[PDB]
Amino acid sequence: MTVAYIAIGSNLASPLEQVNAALKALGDIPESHILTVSSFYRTPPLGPQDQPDYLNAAVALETSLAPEELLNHTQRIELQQGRVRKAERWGPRTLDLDIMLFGNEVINTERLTVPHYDMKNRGFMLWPLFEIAPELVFPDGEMLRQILHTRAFDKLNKW
């Protein structure tokens, strides 16, 4: 068993309803238990800005699944919640489930790259992560508290 940390995002189709449904669905992942859920946060879109604000959260998920098996399940949940791929890079979506961390694992497979490649630059990932895991240390030894103390991230407001 290991603890995975998953980022949640939604900016379409009633984000509060999409995230609450995703949390129920994450509890149905086999060989896995939710440990902790962050507050929900209403965040301005990074990347393309011509889209609605996001509801962002994070979840701690204790699992004995393999990393890619966990990825199968989060992809499934997205697809089952009406996630449709458009050609636009970084367009709006009903649900996004990003594996931020999988224990202390460092993975760069075809389908899966962990830690999430850009999470240490995203307040919408790190603030909810700190709320559920203040003592977190990344695979490379960097402390989550230290990143947030040192680096400028806009203030996050709750939903």
Ligand SMILES: Nc1ncnc2c1ncn2[C@@H]1O[C@H](COP(=O)(O)CP(=O)(O)OP(=O)(O)O)[C@@H](O)[C@H]1O
């Ligand atoms: N840590 C991870 N969590 C989830 N998917 C990941 C992943 N690392 C790689 N992937 C791969 O990422 C592919 C594209 O996912 P998308 O959701 O469209 C990117 P996004 O989440 O919009 O951008 P971002 O990764 O910059 O946040 C997935 O099909 C999956 O194979």
Ligand SMILES: Nc1nc2nc(SCc3ccc(F)cc3)[nH]c2c(=O)[nH]1
């Ligand atoms: N607030 C908010 N904005 C979001 N933009 C995306 S697309 C990826 C992306 C692209 C460039 C960048 F610099 C940061 C994130 N996903 C988001 C999310 O979950 N929340």
Ligand SMILES: [Ca+2]
């Ligand atoms: Ca994402």
Ligand SMILES: [Ca+2]
């Ligand atoms: Ca994603």
Ligand SMILES: [Cl-]
């Ligand atoms: Cl899309």
Ligand SMILES: [Cl-]
């Ligand atoms: Cl979508």
Ligand code: NA
């Ligand atoms: Na479960």
Ligand code: NA
């Ligand atoms: Na656009």
